[PDB]
Amino acid sequence: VKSVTLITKVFPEGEKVCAVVIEYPVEIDGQKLSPDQFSVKVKTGDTYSSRTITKVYANNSGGLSFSIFNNRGKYVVLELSTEDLHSNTIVFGPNFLNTRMKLDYIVSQLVPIFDVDGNEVEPFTSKQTDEKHLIIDDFLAFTFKDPETGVEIPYRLFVPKDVNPDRKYPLVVFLHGAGERGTDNYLQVAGNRGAVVWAQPRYQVVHPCFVLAPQCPPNSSWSTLFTDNPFNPEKPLLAVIKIIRKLLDEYNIDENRIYITGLSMGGYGTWTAIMEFPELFAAAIPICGGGDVSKVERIKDIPIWVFHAEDDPVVPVENSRVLVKKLAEIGGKVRYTEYEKGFMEKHGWDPHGSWIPTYENQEAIEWLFEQSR
Amino acid sequence: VKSVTLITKVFPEGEKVCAVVIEYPVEIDGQKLSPDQFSVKVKTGDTYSSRTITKVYANNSGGLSFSIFNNRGKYVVLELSTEDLHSNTIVFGPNFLNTRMKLDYIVSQLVPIFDVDGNEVEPFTSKQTDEKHLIIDDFLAFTFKDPETGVEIPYRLFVPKDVNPDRKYPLVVFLHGAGERGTDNYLQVAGNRGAVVWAQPRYQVVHPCFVLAPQCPPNSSWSTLFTDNPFNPEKPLLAVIKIIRKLLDEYNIDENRIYITGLSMGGYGTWTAIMEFPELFAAAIPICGGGDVSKVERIKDIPIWVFHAEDDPVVPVENSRVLVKKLAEIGGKVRYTEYEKGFMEKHGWDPHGSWIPTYENQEAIEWLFEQSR
């Protein structure tokens, strides 16, 4: 068997293994395939536990493309349940610091299966020969060192394809994630849909654009939140602005539509970037953060859509209310969606994670792309 | 008993029997009625199986109008569960060709029931004496023969009521449905809410309008999809344009607001009608189809809202993406709602059936009626 390839996809909750794709040396008859023919298990961290296969099928493609008219062949896709316990690639160890386990899978075809010419294909068992990281393999990895010197900032950059080069396109800049701090240049783009949502074909076909997901080192934050008032720019945020300038230097990016959005720490981060560099950004979506209300007047002309859940037990909701109230009463350009108590838990999410429905809200995506300077 | 009348209503999934209405020769006390007093069963096709009665009540009306203040009399309504196995009137036999069984019901009042003057009304059992087809009996049946000659095209036409005649009103033209092909002049209007949604009082009170649901014969399609590139007009679509001209000839229809929408085969159909007759239509909603991207420039000024689910295993989603991407980058007037993988199955629908949420989306109805030339 040529390979068995784990597929990962970023789900509102974070990155998960959603499929295994097995490459056969012959052409499998999908019609006759079924979940009970295979097993897929995940190592954590010393025993394996089962993954629920929900669907099976086939193609000469080898991503997750199902077609009823030819269910075949070389490639067999086993879909996995995203509700499985160990579906997540990221484990939230006991700080504001998550990590991404190396992926450890064993896969077996359990019984013989029929190929297109009606042979049997014999059982096999195998560890994976691959990962493939969906929409997260299309973000370029880069490093930027703040010279003079010298905080290094890994970042991920999505460049649109294939999109006439004598035109300029928006930049969406994203800020994770206390949990997503680190040095690996992956967490920031995998913790949630913050960076990746903008890169989905559904939105790219209609708002082609760049996305920037920089990564804050451990023990630092975007604002002086974790380094002590928590509202001033900290050197990682400082460095991001410079990365933005480099990107406009290097790429056909529309200076009139640089958008910024961020989450929790990256919430503070968003308010802070707009309040310190207010000529730079065309619009903002700060999610469950705070910022300096004495400085709201600087940003009265930036369209902003604020999000926060009422029952956020990590970042008090009042941190959004206060900015929203001041912004609005001074002539504004502000929206505000304050998720009701119980809403989040009703949808199976920690009430801090208000970024989940926010990035799943097509009204807000569309809104952002209507902004300009 | 004067009659027992099956009521049908078109549900997003298609037409179903949702009630039985029994006409008594005296006036029944609804207060005292209950589901366990009756039985309703459906013949398929050689045994009968039970229908779940969910609610009972009464009136001098005899559609499904429940009133708590007088629960009486002549008329007894038994509501049926739309989740029942054999609730659908249409069976999807093994092609791209569905059919509508003749309706075969037996109904019994099981125990004596009380009338308003406190008599008993004795048990009875009966086959149905009637169908009544809701909002599907308000579409006129007509035939059009393409003279010269001679493909005949049955069609259904909803004419608004009662709406000052010295004014012009929009035409909504709908295209089913590979499955809904046939000759009966019913399938097209019963397969799903494609034609009927526009005719609902909720929308008619505020956007009075005509609707046209023509029917494509078997073995043909709207575009050269099923007759072989699948993007050119096939003679049934050709004939529809002529039916549209006849209708403007015959009816006070606003030439500036002829809207077109369609589904799958009728998806291709929609793109095709706009790309070949671009002066004719004011807006379009193509659902899960494709069309010719070399011809997108002709339609750059037609407002279009495209719909497709990501995991459509019949019509690849890329068929919408490609048109959307080209349309947008050339100056557009295009929306796009690409339902996420898992969305459809989460709501109990085959992921091909993206027309179901689309016609259930009040934003899209309203949108269409804001268009004009």
Place this chain on the structure above:
Amino acid sequence: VKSVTLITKVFPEGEKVCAVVIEYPVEIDGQKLSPDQFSVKVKTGDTYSSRTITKVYANNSGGLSFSIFNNRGKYVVLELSTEDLHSNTIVFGPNFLNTRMKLDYIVSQLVPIFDVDGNEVEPFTSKQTDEKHLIIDDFLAFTFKDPETGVEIPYRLFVPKDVNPDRKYPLVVFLHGAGERGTDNYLQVAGNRGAVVWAQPRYQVVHPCFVLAPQCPPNSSWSTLFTDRENPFNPEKPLLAVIKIIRKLLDEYNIDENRIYITGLSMGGYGTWTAIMEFPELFAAAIPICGGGDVSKVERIKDIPIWVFHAEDDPVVPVENSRVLVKKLAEIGGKVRYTEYEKGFMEKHGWDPHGSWIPTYENQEAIEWLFEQSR
């Protein structure tokens, strides 16, 4: 449709309607019948509730019989869940007096059905036209007028069938509990399996067998239980009458003076203890279920085989009532057995702990044991 007949049968917790039999104008093939073609409902008391039909079949007998081989005939049997709420015929009224519901059913064939001839019998709906009381209908009804005391006592008696007139057979006499008191001559045979078990074919065919089941009248009781707060151990008129009727039976029938057994529950349990103690000469063996006791008198019963039953947690009749008789019986040289149902045993099996007669009449060992007794 010729008739619709309610089939009742006495189950451990009393008599329930277990089947409905419809006599069709022609025969019918049951192979093609199915539960969802019919409906069965009870009234209670001004609405109906459904009986759940668990199997449909056909025979030519009219009872419950079914062979895979010939599932056909003019009779269609609809069997009903015995676990249905409204299956019991007897509503337990207060305080200690039960009443049987006049039975009230409507039945439907809902869809056409195939016949042997055929091919279609049309839907019908109907009240019932007949009860059939399976096993209760083999007990002849009689009334006895006690010529010494006026008291009238209705009774039901089972006479064995196809038995040699030249041999003699045992008599089982059953005394019912308070709740079965009445004047209808039905209750005491339908409230539990107390009379009827002895009359089941499974037992009759190995131990043919008369059964006398007397009814005691609503404002007395077998012993001075309900007719005195001093010592409810003395024989009351109804019990005394029962004796005279045992003697009528002996005169009228080929009954074996040496094997007149006696059992009863609760008020009938006191009844049983009182009977054997006041007439030690009469009975071969006794099964007193939840009753009570003249302890001063166990010496007269020293030689009668007795198997006592009671539940530890009986909240109506303290278990100590059986324990005391058994203790004394035992220490005096006995011929006594005693099964005392553990706390919780009854509710575990879904039974009020007072109803200890329920597992007892279901005990094959107990039945067999009674029959190996004699004088």
Place this chain on the structure above:
Amino acid sequence: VKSVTLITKVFPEGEKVCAVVIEYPVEIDGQKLSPDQFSVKVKTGDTYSSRTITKVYANNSGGLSFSIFNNRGKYVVLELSTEDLHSNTIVFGPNFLNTRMKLDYIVSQLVPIFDVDGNEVEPFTSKQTDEKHLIIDDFLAFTFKDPETGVEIPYRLFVPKDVNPDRKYPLVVFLHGAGERGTDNYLQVAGNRGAVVWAQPRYQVVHPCFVLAPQCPPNSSWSTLFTDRENPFNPEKPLLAVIKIIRKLLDEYNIDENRIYITGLSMGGYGTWTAIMEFPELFAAAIPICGGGDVSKVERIKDIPIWVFHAEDDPVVPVENSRVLVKKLAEIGGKVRYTEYEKGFMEKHGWDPHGSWIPTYENQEAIEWLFEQSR
């Protein structure tokens, strides 16, 4: 991997695959094994379904034995739910003829596992390489050729072990039902616990014991049941042959002429009734389960202890068939017992009411009773 062995065992409703034993090249610690490390599947008939693995453990025996103390060895046992749909080895074909499925399994170790040495045996997948028939493999296979009639009769015989050659022991002869007819010499010992119960260690160790289990051939039957519609009570060739083989056994073995017991079910129940009535001199005691009867002949069997079993609602063999023999037996002076399973009792326990042999062979009282009989 040295072998993968299917363990079958005869359960009350017939023979099921209950375990899969894998012989590994080294020993293994079961302390560290768990059900989710393996997979077990049957074919039927061109797909597989899973057997549910309920416990994993190791021994050095190769059978089902497990001690908490040393959960280790080259053998790994995967125990399987006996409630799985595809556990039975025997598919009930029509009309009255069952067939055993050639067995078809694939087994997997899915993840690496720790060994004693060690530390890793890699995943493998495999068809089985062996059946082991637990208890059916102690019955020697023989065929007898009846020299008077040509008929060939395959039979299985259990010979006791570690028993004194100088004493003599009982013979239990089992006659199987219609469905077990055939020519394979396996069916009649695997279809139910009829032969094998007598051969279980729990009983052998208190009542050592030969068991003869003859097979009757697909187009006849023990009595003139299936070979005549006039009176299916006469001995047919297969039964007659069985007698001759009892005599061979007596000649060849230290069997006690005074304790040749006989039981069978259904066609074997008729068989049993016919055998004892036509050869009253031969058998010490009989257990005929759902069979039928020459009533004219019970006088010859007057002195044979007999315990009849039947279910009231048997839809294949009317219960009246047992009732009639029992009634007569009883009134003539007997030595007859009779347990008749109440309507519903069988389905309550999940059993077709015809299979009354199932609770019967599970009755310790019945087994014990047979062994206290003799001439």
Place this chain on the structure above:
Amino acid sequence: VKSVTLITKVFPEGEKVCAVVIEYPVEIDGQKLSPDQFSVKVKTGDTYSSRTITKVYANNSGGLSFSIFNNRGKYVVLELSTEDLHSNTIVFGPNFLNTRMKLDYIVSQLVPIFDVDGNEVEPFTSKQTDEKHLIIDDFLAFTFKDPETGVEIPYRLFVPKDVNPDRKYPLVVFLHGAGERGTDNYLQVAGNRGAVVWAQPRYQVVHPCFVLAPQCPPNSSWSTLFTDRENPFNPEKPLLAVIKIIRKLLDEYNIDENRIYITGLSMGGYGTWTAIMEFPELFAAAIPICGGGDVSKVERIKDIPIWVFHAEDDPVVPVENSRVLVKKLAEIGGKVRYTEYEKGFMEKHGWDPHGSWIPTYENQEAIEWLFEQSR
């Protein structure tokens, strides 16, 4: 509130807290009480979990007694689900040594309640103030000092009540299993129904009865089981001591030398086998449950009635241990019975297969049988 008393009772799997009784300052009507007015909780070990209250009622006794008739008094009984996780008093520690939890409860009346006087007792909350050990509190505690060997042996002895001093009565001696070893004199009477069943009123009233339940000390065991890897069949000091104490009892009490019965499980099963084989003259009958054997010695026990019990799949004590003694007993002329619980039987009933003492002490046949034995 006068007191809150924990009611414990010995259930087949050991002693559980089954009720909580509250003594109120006045009487109370239980007719008006309901489970949701109270709360009951255990500690374990630094949190509490709820006991589920299944019924509330009142009496004037203080124990579990309830009559429908007078549901009233100063005592309020809260009955608790015996299926609750934290109901057992005994935590099974390692390796083979169990310990009883000091008991730790808090109880609440949550809402006001109506009294007889009345009309309101206010909410209260409280630790318990009392245990009451139902049946374990009828066994007097004693210690014996073996004057030949120093060994001290605690024991519990049940003396019958209201019994004639002039007659003599049986002695049942129970030897507990490894886990009940200790020095507390409680374990061996609370770990299972081994001692206490004989002491239940249901049995006492038909077979009055002493029960001796000795405790063996944590680092030995009745036979040379845990004190030698050569042959664990010899009498160890603790067993020897037990004998001397049987003799003390005979001296001190009206015990019948002809009916000293003996039973024990596991380590107590070995104990039982060893006892009767080394002192054949002493015991009338034995029930050894999952134990093991000096096979060379069964000839001395040839005449002792013995009913052995073991489960086929016991993973601690191989069933072959019972099979071997039974086989020999049988072939030598016996007086031996043997019930061997089938594989799966135990787990089906929710029991570890080693605990075969659980169904055994629940077997009325076994109990009755022991009592018909004598010399």
